[PDB]
């Protein structure tokens, strides 16, 4: 099951799906929020060699995208223009309506070549690639992203 | 929620697309509205009672489950997650017969 955050009296707990708290109140879908948090915020190395070592190519797994409503300002974002030695593109073009991450202090734009032994580039630790309000399992070409993970919250209101 | 990350960012500089209200003039019209880069609002939320760090941990602990969901569905883009969570929230209380003075019935 998917976890859900409960903020009551400035306190956060995981909602127990087995338990039932009748005092919890959800009076509107505005009280439901999805939030993107940056791996940056967990202390991960942001230098280009470590970040690119966290990503890897794989075939056979169709990409998947899920939206999120709010995100975190990133100090470090990345934008990749990688080709194979034969000149062909390693990464697909951004789908319609997938724009770059909206708040980046530094955009690390990496160009070069690799073997690209796989149809899509995924995060080796299972994190997501955060774009303009869309999180994907794969990297799109020429499109600024942040590394991150998604939480779901009921805000008190 | 026990934060088990190597380090934590105590400050949350959040951006969102929900309007804050009191929209000035006719700026809601897409022609006169801002570009795609200026439709966001910002805010600063400090670490209170150890919330912020915990939130990050939550996201981490969510990831796995979320991935599994994305494996099951065939939607190229999945937007109906929050709505489904609300539907399950309602079914949890009112899905079956609500017996007064019962554990699965929230009445008075």
């Amino acid at each position, epitope marked *: 099951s998917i976890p859900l955050g409960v903020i009551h009296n400035s306190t956060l707990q995981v909602s127990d799906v087995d338990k039932l708290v009748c005092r919890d109140k959800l009076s509107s879908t505005n009280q439901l929020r999805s939030v993107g948090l940056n791996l*940056e*915020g*967990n*202390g991960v*190395a*942001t230098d280009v060699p470590s970040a690119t070592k966290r990503w890897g190519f794989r075939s056979g797994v169709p990409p998947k995208v899920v939206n999120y409503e709010a995100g975190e300002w990133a*100090e470090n974002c990345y934008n990749l223009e990688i080709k194979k030695p034969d000149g062909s593109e390693c990464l697909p073009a951004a789908p319609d309506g997938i724009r770059g991450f909206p708040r980046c*202090r530094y955009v690390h734009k990496v160009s070069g070549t690799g073997p690209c032994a796989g149809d899509f580039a995924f995060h080796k630790e299972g994190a997501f690639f955060l774009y303009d309000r869309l999180a994907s399992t794969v990297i799109y070409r020429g499109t600024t992203f942040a590394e991150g993970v998604v939480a779901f919250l009921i805000l008190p209101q | 929620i026990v934060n088990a990350q*190597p*380090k*934590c*960012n*105590p*400050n949350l*500089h959040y951006w969102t697309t929900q309007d804050e209200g009191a929209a000035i003039g006719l700026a809601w019209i897409p022609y006169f509205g801002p570009a795609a880069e200026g439709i966001y609002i910002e805010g*600063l939320m*400090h*670490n209170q009672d150890g919330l912020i760090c915990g939130l990050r941990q939550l996201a981490n602990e969510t990831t796995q489950a979320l991935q599994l969901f994305l494996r099951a569905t065939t939607e190229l883009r999945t937007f109906s997650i929050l709505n489904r969570k609300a539907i399950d929230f309602l079914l949890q209380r009112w899905g079956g017969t609500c017996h007064i003075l019962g554990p699965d019935c929230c009445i008075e």
Partner: antibody
Amino acid sequence: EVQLVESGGGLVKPGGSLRLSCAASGFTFSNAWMSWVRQAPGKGLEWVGRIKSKTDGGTIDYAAPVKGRFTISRDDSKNTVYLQMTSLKTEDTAVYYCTTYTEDMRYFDWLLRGGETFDYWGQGTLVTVSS
Amino acid sequence: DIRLTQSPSSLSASVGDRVTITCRASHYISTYLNWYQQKPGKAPKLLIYAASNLQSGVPSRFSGSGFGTDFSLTISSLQPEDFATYHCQQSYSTPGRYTFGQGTKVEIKR
């Protein structure tokens, strides 16, 4: 719960040496970064030096008007840090404070920057240099 | 390397007023400031780490704000024990010569 005590301050003539000692108790000394910060009578606070823990390599850094004349060391078996002052000049007359960078604030730094947040401060000692 | 400039240099306000001190940085810094309280004759006491974060034990009237180059410290309602000189210090890089601000001394009005 946490307390630091500075000792060894006194009057020294310009060009002389002097040894300052900083005793700490109430925390994990071997995992915390130590730092010396001095305050002149009319110049406010001025950072002097920094020493890492034995985990991060224990590299030492000094200030620009300070390099080449001072030397920091640490003893983890006694939870003490020492500051040695050689070829001292009259501008170094100040109130010296010994500060600690606890392991808990390492955990709050998320961009992995070398700078530190000074957690706890000791009483401080007086170092006067005059002819 | 990095310059910090406080404002104002001296301040006089009454008990219960909203006090705000500004700390400006020369280079770019993402919430590495720290607010220290130093009472005369005693050692500086850490109040705020990073931005808007209160150290355990600090009363609720203290609050921080800001990012980037400008930062703000706010006391909602002054109290007699708050009379002290406050300093802002950056932790973005290895500390330089001007890493600590000159200081802002708050004075109580009666």
